[PDB]
Amino acid sequence: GFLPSFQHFATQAIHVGQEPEQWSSRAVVLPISLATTFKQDSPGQSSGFVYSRSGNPTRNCLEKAVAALDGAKHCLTFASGLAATTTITHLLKAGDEVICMDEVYGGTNRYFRRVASEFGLKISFVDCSKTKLLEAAITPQTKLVWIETPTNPTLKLADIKACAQIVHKHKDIILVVDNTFMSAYFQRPLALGADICMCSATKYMNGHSDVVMGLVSVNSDDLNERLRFLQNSLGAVPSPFDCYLCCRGLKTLQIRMEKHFRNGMAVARFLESNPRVEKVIYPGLPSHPQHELAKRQCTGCPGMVSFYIKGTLQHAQVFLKNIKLFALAESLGGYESLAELPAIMTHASVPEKDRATLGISDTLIRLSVGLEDEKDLLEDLGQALKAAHP
Amino acid sequence: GFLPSFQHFATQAIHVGQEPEQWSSRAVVLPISLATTFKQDSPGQSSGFVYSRSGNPTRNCLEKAVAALDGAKHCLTFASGLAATTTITHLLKAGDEVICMDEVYGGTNRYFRRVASEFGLKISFVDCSKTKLLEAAITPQTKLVWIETPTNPTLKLADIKACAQIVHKHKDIILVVDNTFMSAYFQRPLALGADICMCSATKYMNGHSDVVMGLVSVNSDDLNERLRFLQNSLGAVPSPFDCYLCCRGLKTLQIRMEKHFRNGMAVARFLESNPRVEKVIYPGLPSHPQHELAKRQCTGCPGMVSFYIKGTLQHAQVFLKNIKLFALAESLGGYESLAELPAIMTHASVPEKDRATLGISDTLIRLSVGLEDEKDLLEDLGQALKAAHP
Amino acid sequence: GFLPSFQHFATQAIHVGQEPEQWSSRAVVLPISLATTFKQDSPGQSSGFVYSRSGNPTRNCLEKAVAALDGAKHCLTFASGLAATTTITHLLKAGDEVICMDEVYGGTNRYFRRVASEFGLKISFVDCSKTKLLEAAITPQTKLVWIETPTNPTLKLADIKACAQIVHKHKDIILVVDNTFMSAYFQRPLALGADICMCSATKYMNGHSDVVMGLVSVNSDDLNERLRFLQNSLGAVPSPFDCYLCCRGLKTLQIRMEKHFRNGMAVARFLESNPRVEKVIYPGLPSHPQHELAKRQCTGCPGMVSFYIKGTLQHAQVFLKNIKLFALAESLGGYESLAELPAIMTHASVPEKDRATLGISDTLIRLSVGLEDEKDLLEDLGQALKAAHP
Amino acid sequence: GFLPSFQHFATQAIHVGQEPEQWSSRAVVLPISLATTFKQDSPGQSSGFVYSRSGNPTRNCLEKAVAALDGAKHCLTFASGLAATTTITHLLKAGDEVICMDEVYGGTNRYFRRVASEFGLKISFVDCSKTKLLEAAITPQTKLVWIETPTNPTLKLADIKACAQIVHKHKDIILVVDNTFMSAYFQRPLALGADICMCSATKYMNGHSDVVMGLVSVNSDDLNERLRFLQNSLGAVPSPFDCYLCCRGLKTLQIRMEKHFRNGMAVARFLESNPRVEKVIYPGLPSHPQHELAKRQCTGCPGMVSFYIKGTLQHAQVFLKNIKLFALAESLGGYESLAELPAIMTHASVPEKDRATLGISDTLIRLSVGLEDEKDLLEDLGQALKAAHP
Ligand SMILES: Cc1ncc(COP(=O)(O)O)c(/C=N/NC(=O)C(N)=O)c1O
Ligand SMILES: Cc1ncc(COP(=O)(O)O)c(/C=N/NC(=O)C(N)=O)c1O
Ligand SMILES: Cc1ncc(COP(=O)(O)O)c(/C=N/NC(=O)C(N)=O)c1O
Ligand SMILES: Cc1ncc(COP(=O)(O)O)c(/C=N/NC(=O)C(N)=O)c1O
């Protein structure tokens, strides 16, 4: 019952920006161009490449592919998801206000709360799953609304089209959607009214746990010009080698995301029927409080499954010590299954009282379900839960 | 007559941080670890690696080597020299003031003037080659003094020890020296009183025109803690692949820099006796106005030579069209000889009236003398100057 | 109606040999170790790494993963499929005889016919699709039988179990199956009686058209010892960087091969009903003469589809000029759709009279169907065939 | 008193084959093109790239640079020095004879003695430092003479011009010189009458202990055609990534080799005056028995120094356990100083009686002197020798 799949996604992921005719060799795969500089025909010629930080063949090719997958006219790549977040925030100026989704990646929270707030920006954290709370938080000084959906790590949704309608009633507010948890294959925020589609390509977009990278996609020529200026001027740019590996990852994005959905749904159903589990959170389950919204704004669901184990922190620790296929590690969106305890790991920097309000408790486990055989994943979770609750 | 050479530099560049015992394999060369994440023995363990952006084996190994070469306790790597500049600026807060050397890389000028200044920072450009002008510009709100020496692109010097003495009479002012043009082999700002030694590793430190990277070295544990927080929280981090290539470049840094000095001095002497050249600028020539200061604060001089061609922009254009070994291109500090026209290329973003005051005229040519045979370089410059002025 | 799928394949492709505990860092992804050499605790210690050609961490990790996917105890990697072929041939000696499948890759034919035959080896080409012809060609001097199934490029099959039974009635004959066209996911020659499973990892195993590599898998400890001696002594070894990229490719092998099968079957059915096509060859179609054998010895079929266009070479040339999604290029098994004319390209070195006997005519087109959207692939073939035959 | 230095070597190492005009981007540094295949304008077009094993942009660019440095018209790259040796041996046929220098790398000995000899080739090991022994070993069946000079590991020389005159009195004998120990910077066998200049680029040519590679340089169009056929048909080809790193290494070859000579000469003089050393071998010392020949056929000497420690294997082991800057490890020609015991390590495969005849005793230590500070290297050797002989 999800939105129908993007129909040319796999074709675009393989071909857009990848014409062999652009290379002297007619290579069918884009070259890795490491050169920092490029010979000019005359001083300050306005065409061709000039300096790697400003633009380079491998990065420019990746940006064309990602733009197509995000349904965007323009894409910019960065050294990390947090570097993308920093660059977007530099669109503003002293005196501006940001509204941020109350539950975000701990590093996003840390950046807004401890860094951006020291340079004349006012930050408010608001539960944007309730559109009336977003409506009430907007002031004439609001210039940016930052929403993750689903949220890291409790997988709360925001209605992107409903939030876009609220913010676009006001003059000059940018809506950013952090699309990291869904990927371009399952959610397209620019088609739902977002002004900026941002993600940590570190996760599903690259998909191989071997690249740290941020991606920012826009339709606005004004936002493109302002962001291009900052990509060049702050210089938080990715290695061309990383651009190559991320481009290589995109070639399998459609088939990886379909497998993450099959495995994720099987894990979520398994946990929901296991008596050692207090509560499962997966947007693809009917039990998710926003399951109907997920079907209205997504084409499917990835491999992110969160659950509350029965008991206390001690039981969560025993579960995470006994997993043998899932690895206790940070990150998500790789081919390999990962598990973490957000309260002690990714969200340790979020104040304890804020974690309590958000439901980031000492029994919340976040799973990133990989591409392994379903039966092997369910046997691993089963035996680890039995070790925690004999 | 320069300061005596650093005596263990080549040994440290090859061995510091490179112990084979730290690798399971006992590899004599550091591995490239691309992994974004690392398996933990228990949740939030305080030791080992956690997440690539926060720290990773290849980057941490490079940072240990660069720290030793800069005479520093601590080193941080960034996605670019401009990302290093952005990260250092985030040490401050709204209401603080920066004093910047009046002549800097065009991108540094653009960042301070057009970006940092919009986030509650006051920026003043001061000729820090005159220590009384630096003294007079300091206010109680000054928190950062940013000096390049020699300057890009007219190779003006600042007396680092004299500037350090002035800023350290006040409470809580950070002195940054951008050491890009000298390299760690020829100038050690932390030994002359700088608080931060910054460079674009894109240039001499890597030396192979195939890595964009920034390096920041400090002795202060307070500055290390604040900068480490921002490396992690802004996420302007380098690829581990780029860290490997930069580490590979450091292994030849001493012998490259000695050859840049031999070739640079030969080019400067050749241009100084050529009647088609109005004026040569090279800190190693007795004709440089600050030659005596260069000998007091450096162990030598690299391959950066600037000159004013006789005549007009038309003659500069004909010279740059006729060079056949030197390539018309941005960047510097590579094995390959490069030439540019800063007024139209690297410094085009600096307002025309500011270029005029700084001496960045339409006849100023910046050379980066590479590692080619001296006779081939002198014949190339000779025939190109003859094409401009028969 | 194919053999049932390998059930732990995806789990093994992700986990076998990839334990984080083997790395000092506990990296969840294998490091790229470029080091040529490794520090020894004492001279000629028998444990640990010694010299990259003899063995190295990245290559040894890939070999463990491939061995599991081939159902093998041992795997050896080489610089190319042809280097694997050369190394296997060096198992023999002057006076030995090789029987080779009559239709093989042009380069395999060239190696046996023009190179191996000059070093005291007698080569006979035999149609091993007819087991009585194999039986009749074996002499007391036969030491190696080399079979490709399906064959490059007309996709003829050999009954591996039936050929194994024939050769194993004799003393000391090695049966090699070149598994390049099926991949480890769809065919397991070691489980059907082959002594050696060889492939060009250049094709499906890597799957991203960015690595040239050969793989050889065995169960015999004797063959492992003899081949390991030759991997080290001929030195036709892969780069650790290439081993990393091939390992990265294996992580998606199961889901890529399932998509190649869906797309390949759709293309084959489309060509079979198109009146501009003389004849389609696809082992998954009931029309293939050996369709029933394919179902008895394989778990599916990949994306290799061959067809004879109606008319002459001129029509084949017009088809190959008008394809806009398929690219005219050598190779196969990549994510991108490729087309070639074997008589003029891959099999040009095979004598014209031998091409005629094998059915490698000037109207035979070989397609490698990639991972693009099925509808886009069928529209591209349709419009190109219409350009050839209005 | 050595031959005068090659005068354009550094210019050629940086520029030959590296024209920015050949790249669409005008990159000043060659791109890494990993593509296995290349789009053709029509089937079997005779120009452009076709298939990575047959030729590719990065490898072809490296081959142009190495050809210039070897004074050759043609260069071919291979997966290793041993793969280059295997490929050259495939120039022959059953019934041909090879004469090999009696002292060679252990792996070269193993290949000729245990592998090539099984394919109808007769191998004779001859002390080619005595030209009358070479003259007497030649028969009408001799087709190849293989000489290393200086030899691995006792640094015996052969007079290349005198050996060339002897073999070229006969019809159709190829003289190969393995130039690994000298590098192209110090010895040019093609200018002294060799038909083939071969080396392990694993050592000095790459110089960074991170690439395994073989290089073969020729002037003959006949040898080029025959070797090109075998590079393509045996497929023992290097990764384009390895070709890039080797090309990057060549940019510093001149300055690295000059430093290896300064450090190597200082180490040799230090060992020659140390009472814990029985005998030092270094071609640059007047004490070397062939010092006068070294000055007639080389432009200098690299960092390879061999010595016999006083006493027994126990003293050699204590020396190799106490070195703290030199590392006990195989290989040579890197920036890092290495030491090995050839009798137990590189030459363990050579029969014990052959080692005795050649002087490869249990007290022979081979040093590869790196690019560290001279004083640090002499202090390390001094303290390690004192640990062995208090
Ligand atoms: C929704 C979302 N947005 C941005 C980022 C930052 O991206 P980067 O790390 O590329 O700077 C992340 C990182 N999450 N990492 C984790 O949750 C973990 N480390 O496990 C995120 O989850
Ligand atoms: C003194 C100095 N500091 C910092 C940077 C920025 O470093 P990055 O480019 O790594 O962000 C540069 C760049 N110079 N580039 C040139 O002058 C050219 N592009 O020719 C610089 O010269
Ligand atoms: C069945 C089979 N076995 C071995 C090889 C050699 O492998 P390598 O090229 O890695 O040395 C190939 C190459 N085929 N390439 C093509 O058909 C093309 N070039 O289109 C093959 O098809
Ligand atoms: C003179 C000479 N020629 C060829 C090779 C083989 O090259 P490759 O290793 O690239 O196949 C070597 C290797 N020597 N390695 C050593 O001496 C060591 N392993 O210490 C050699 O020394």
Numbering used by the authors:
A (entry chain A), B (entry chain D), C (entry chain C), D (entry chain B): 10 to 399
Text lifted from the article:
D,L-Propargylglycine (PAG) has been widely used as a selective inhibitor to investigate the biological functions of cystathionine γ-lyase (CSE), which catalyzes the formation of reactive sulfur species (RSS). CSE produces H2S during the metabolism of cysteine, and also generates cysteine persulfide (CysSSH) from cystine as a substrate. However, PAG also inhibits other PLP (pyridoxal-5′-phosphate)-dependent enzymes such as methionine γ-lyase (MGL) and L-alanine transaminase (ALT), so highly selective CSE inhibitors are still required. Here, we performed high-throughput screening (HTS) of a large chemical library and identified oxamic hydrazide 1 as a potent inhibitor of CSE (IC50 = 13 ± 1 μM (mean ± S.E.)) with high selectivity over other PLP-dependent enzymes and RSS-generating enzymes.
We then determined the high-resolution (1.9 Å) X-ray crystal structure of the rCSE complex with 1, and found that the hydrazide group of 1 forms a Schiff base linkage with the aldehyde group of PLP in the active site of rCSE, affording PLP-1. Moreover, several amino acid residues of rCSE (Glu339, Ser340, Arg375 and Asn161) around the CSE active site form hydrogen bonds with oxygen atoms of 1 in PLP-1. The optimized cis form showed a dihedral angle defined by N–C–C–N of the dicarbonyl structure of PLP-1 of around 40 degrees, while the energy minimum of the trans form was located near the dihedral angle of 180 degrees. These results indicate that PLP-1 can take both cis and trans conformations, though the cis-form of PLP-1 appears to be preferred in the crystal structure as judged from B-factor analysis. In this context, it is noteworthy that the substrate pocket of rCSE is relatively small in our X-ray crystal structure. In the pocket of rCSE, PLP occupies 181 Å3, while the size of 1 is 71 Å3. In addition, PLP is located at a position that restricts entry to the pocket, and it is estimated that the space through which molecules can enter is only about 70 Å3. Thus, the covalent bond formation between 1 and PLP seems likely to contribute to the high selectivity and potent inhibitory activity of 1 toward CSE, in addition to the multiple hydrogen bonding interactions between the inhibitor and the amino acid residues at the active site of CSE. We also confirmed that all amino acid residues of rCSE involved in the recognition of 1 are conserved in hCSE.
